[PDB]
Design an enzyme around this catalytic site. Structure first.
Site, short mmCIF file in Angstrom:
data_model
loop_
_atom_site.label_atom_id
_atom_site.label_comp_id
_atom_site.label_asym_id
_atom_site.label_seq_id
_atom_site.Cartn_x
_atom_site.Cartn_y
_atom_site.Cartn_z
N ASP A 157 46.41 20.56 3.37
CA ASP A 157 45.24 20.38 4.18
C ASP A 157 44.82 18.89 3.91
OD1 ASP A 157 42.88 19.94 5.74
OD2 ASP A 157 41.61 21.49 4.50
N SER A 193 43.18 5.64 17.00
CA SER A 193 44.38 5.64 18.12
C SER A 193 43.93 4.86 19.03
CB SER A 193 44.29 7.08 18.68
OG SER A 193 45.05 7.06 19.86
#
EC number: 3.4.23.22
Length: 330
Positions: free
Chosen positions: A35, A199
């Site tokens: 994770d 992004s």
């Protein structure tokens, strides 16, 4: 040193991935959910409330000649899905894919929430976010990566998740045979303890690319791609009969649909998520309503590049003094 371990989907939908991890002496092999959105290595154990264990493999520290109680240490963690677990702490030897850390904090669960009990395939979590998020008290502990980093050939690990197939986590090297073209690296903020990056935009299917900054986290422990409501609405608008369902808890679409791809930007580079990666199948057994793999991050307070996004790329988690992320197509 290096390590290399295969990661395997837990089910036919790629809801999560499990990686075998050797704990203790002699080794006890548990299948952990790696994770990158949390920082605790915790396991089902001989200490877990018996009624909360249903098929998981347990760590038994009394059977490990290298286990030591970390006296007074406790842990308690809450995840984004509302699941939780808590317990006490041992140090022990932990190996992943041939890479060994001595003295790793292994957080033994006394209590787990219902979602962990009901998932027999996941024997615990191995956190790979920044050690600032680790929940051990009163002495915060380091992640497996942070403890291994100085010994690695390069201070990196990579995630190469499969679509409906096994993939690989590597530690300490970048497998130049595992990706196509070049790796584009992008800046990371560690302010919130995550692999947080921005992004450069998105496209839906064959549509034109929208240049827009989307701050989010690279999170291997989250199944889906959670993005701003504007972006998600633009995606599902291209699927006949898709709609947001308050009853179901997100966007659903007709199982008869063919889904468009979704592209996200990494600097000037583009990662394309095929439409099939966005299908999470019937909402309930036998239903013709299917659950979408792109969902709104509204009310979550962060955008999450979960497995839907990451499985479309070869992803470098660069733990150099100034961390960065890399993405390549594959």
């Amino acid at each position: 040193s290096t390590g290399s371990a295969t990661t395997t989907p837990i089910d036919s939908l790629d809801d999560a991935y499990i990686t075998p991890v050797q704990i203790g002496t002699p080794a006890q092999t548990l299948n952990l959910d790696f994770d990158t959105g949390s920082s605790d290595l915790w396991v089902f154990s001989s200490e877990t409330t018996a009624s909360e264990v249903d098929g998981q493999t347990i760590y038994t520290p009394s059977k490990s000649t290298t286990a030591k109680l970390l006296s007074g240490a406790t842990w308690s963690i809450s995840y984004g899905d509302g699941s939780s677990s808590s317990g006490d702490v041992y140090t022990d030897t932990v190996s992943v894919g041939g890479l060994t850390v001595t003295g790793q904090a292994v957080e033994s669960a006394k209590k787990v929430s219902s979602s962990f009990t009901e998932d027999s395939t996941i024997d615990g979590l191995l956190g790979l976010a920044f050690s600032t998020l680790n929940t051990v008290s009163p002495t915060q502990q380091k992640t497996f990566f942070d403890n291994a980093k100085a010994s690695l050939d390069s201070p990196v690990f990579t995630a190469d998740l499969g679509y409906h197939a096994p993939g690989t986590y590597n530690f300490g090297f970048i497998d130049t045979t595992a990706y196509t073209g070049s790796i584009t690296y992008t800046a990371v903020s560690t302010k919130q303890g995550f692999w947080e990056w921005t992004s450069t935009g998105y496209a839906v299917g064959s549509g034109t690319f929208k240049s827009t900054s989307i701050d989010g986290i690279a999170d291997t422990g989250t199944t889906l791609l959670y993005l701003p409501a504007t972006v998600v609405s633009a995606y599902w608008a291209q699927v006949s009969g898709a709609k947001s369902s308050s009853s179901v808890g997100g966007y659903v679409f007709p199982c008869s649909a063919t889904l468009p791809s979704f592209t996200f930007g990494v600097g000037s580079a583009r990662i394309v998520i095929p439409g099939d990666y966005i299908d999470f199948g019937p909402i309930s057994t036998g239903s013709s309503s299917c659950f979408g793999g792109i969902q709104s991050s509204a009310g979550i307070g962060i955008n999450i590049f979960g497995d839907v996004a990451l499985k479309a790329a070869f992803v470098v988690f660069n733990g150099a003094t100034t961390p960065t992320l890399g993405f390549a197509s594959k």
